[model samples]
Structure formats: structure tokens, C-alpha cells
Target: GSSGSSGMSPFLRIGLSNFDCGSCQSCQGEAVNPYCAVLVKEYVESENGQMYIQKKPTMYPPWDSTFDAHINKGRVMQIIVKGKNVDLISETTVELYSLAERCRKNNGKTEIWLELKPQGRMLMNARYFLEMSGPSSG
Candidate 1:
């Protein structure tokens, strides 16, 4: 169990950018954006190595979201798995996999942040479970 130069596990880092939401008319030159995150970046890595991908998030002054309009799939997170440990991806193969969303947290009134849950697994698995059940009913 070793970490990279950053002393952290080689994992995914997302870069969000390039928002072209047509409905952003309500948000003028200097006003909080009435939308959620507009982009996503999923880097595939579970081992130790290095990687840097930047589509980038460019949030300007207008940081005052009042009434936001969006849907389930409003954000478009691109999967760009390229960079350090690029070799791991070149060899290690797999099957039975899918991505999903497990939970979300509301930072503030106008900001609703959502997290991703990769299918068939997560950052973890193999439940800790209730070790000592009070008398099993068999």
C-alpha cells in the first residue's frame, strides 16, 4: 500500500469545464449561475502512480445562484483515463462493471452537489456487518 509523490493513493481526479447551457440566460454578466456543475472528468486508476488531467472549472464572480434549473443528466463528465499508471490500464482487464450514484450532499441553498458510485463496487466492499447479532432466529 504505497502512495504517489503526493503521498496519496493513485486515484481519480476530475476537471470540469466548458459549460454551454442555453438556459443560462437568467444569469447575466455579473450574477450567480443558475445551474449545477456542467462537466465531469473520470480518470480510471486504482493503483499507485501519477496523473494530471484538466478540463478545468472556471467559476467567475457571479457567485449567486438563486433559482437553478436542471435534470438527472445535466452534467456531462467525460472519461479521460490517461496519464501516470497508464500502463496499468493498458493491461489489467475486467468484466461486469457499471457506474452509479450512491449519495449526495447539499452544500448550500443554491448548490446541490452529487457524487458518483461506480457499479459492481465502490471505494470499498465486503460489509463490516453486525458482528454480534442478539440470538439468531433460525
Candidate 2:
């Protein structure tokens, strides 16, 4: 009588390759002291369910940060890049399920570029793996 046993916790491995803020009109040139923030929010769980998983305000480019986290169902990931005065440079959002399907189709590892608003390009490396339990643990 298998019923409602649809629970799964997967692992998400993502990395920030680089943030290209080269053509932002506000910037007028290369952004100075720019930083990045990666946010994960579980929209299916709460009204305002968001977590600032990684923040690199003090780090300089090329921005290369490795991220590994437990990704359950109904989650959304967002990337935000800011300037020296904390002005918004660029931002983008990704559906978690889309990424899952992408990596799953790509055999669990894939890299892609995210085009952001107001002239920005972000290179991202994404990997997805499912978590399985061992049988009959004593």
C-alpha cells in the first residue's frame, strides 16, 4: 500500500564562475568593488521564505565561490550583483526545477550563462544529485 511516499532531498552543487558587469549604463564602465549574493527561497513553505546562503561583499572578482546545499522541492534561486556603493548592478532568478531538469538531463553537471537585467552576464556551474538511503541499517 504505497501512498504519499514522495519525499526526496537532493543535493545542489553550484559555483559562481564570474560576474560580467561590463555594460551597465549606471556603471558606465567596470564596476568598482562589486560583490555578489546568492539567495535560496522555499516558496512552497512560507510566505517570505528566503535564505541568504552566500554573500561575497568583500571578495573581488573573478568571483569564484563554491556552493553546496540540500535542495528540497519548491525552491527558487536568485543571484544579485551589487556595486561599490551597494547600488544594484544586476540580478536574475532561476527556477529550481528547471535547474534540476537541466543537470539531470546533462548527467548531473552542467554550466550555463545567466543574462541579467540592465546589461550583465553571469557564468554559473550547476550540479544536481539525489540523496538515497541505505537499506536495512542495523
Candidate 3:
């Protein structure tokens, strides 16, 4: 991911809400509140492959709530690429996912949301919604 004009990581912010890690195996033994195990797995893979990795996302406290928010707010994640600040796309995309979840009761199944943006803007300003339904029995 590249930084924007301000030499900050192109990511302006990221937030994930309505997620539960209690049922995830990787979160089982941590003293602190657990984050998604998949994130840890991704980081390990990135490191072992000599890929540049971003900071691990922290879980918000009071995990019993129906909403959680993570924000870079005024700050941005930054990385130097090609000697210029290129806004990273990950922060926007990930944050959009959170926005999608905001309209759902995401507990027992997979939910989805989609939005089409004109281009070159932060995700916080996009129009999107959640699609909720029962899980498929396999």
C-alpha cells in the first residue's frame, strides 16, 4: 500500500463492527480480548514470505456490544512506494466492509454488502447496505 500526498498510508481509516471471536479457535487462550484469527494467519504468512505487513488490528473493548469501530481518523497508515505517496486501497475497502455490516444482525450467517463509487474518494462517503439471511445447511 502506498501513502497519500501527505506521506501517510493511503488508508484513512478502517472499522469492523458486529463481529464475534468467541467461537474462533485462535481467540481461545488470549489474555486480552481476541481479534479475528484469520488476521494473525495472514500476518504470519506475509512475514514468512518476506512481504511487508501492516500493524495487527486491535479488538475493541466491551465486546458484548453489537457494534465496534476502528478508525485512523485524522491519521493515516503510510508506506513509501515508488518514492511517492500513493493512497493505499486496503483501508478504504476494509472500512467499506464495516459499513456494510452496520446494517445487519450478523451473528449466525454470512452477510454481504456492495457499493459502487465514482472513484478517488474515501469509503466513508460511499453508499452501501447489508444483505442478511440464514446460513445454508450443508
TM, every model: 0.19, 0.64, 0.19
Residue 118 accuracy (lDDT) in model 3: 26
Whole-structure CA lDDT of model 2: 0.65
Top model number, TM-score: 2
User: Cα miss at 30, model 2 (Å)?
Assistant: 12
RMSD of 3: 19.0
**TM-score, cand. 1:** 0.19
Model 1 lDDT per residue over 1-138, tens place: 232243221111122233222243564566432323223322444467644343346222222322121112222332221224232111111111111122111121111122222211112111111112133223
Off by over 4 Å in 2: 1-8, 23-33, 45-62, 130-138
Q: lDDT by residue for model 2 over 29-127, one digit each (tens)?
A: 553665676666654334577543332233232457676655555556777786576568778987665677688688667878888997688777888
Q: Quote the RMSD, in angstroms, for model 2.
A: 7.9
lDDT of 3: 0.29
* lDDT tens per residue, model 3, 22-135: 233654553542322212112223534744344545333232223322232221222111112333222122332333344334332233332223222211222222223323
- Candidate 1: deviation at residue 96, Å? 15
**CA-lDDT, candidates in order:** 0.24, 0.65, 0.29
Residue 13 alpha-carbon offset, candidate 1, angstroms:
1.2
Runs in model 3 deviating more than 4 A are 1-52, 70-138
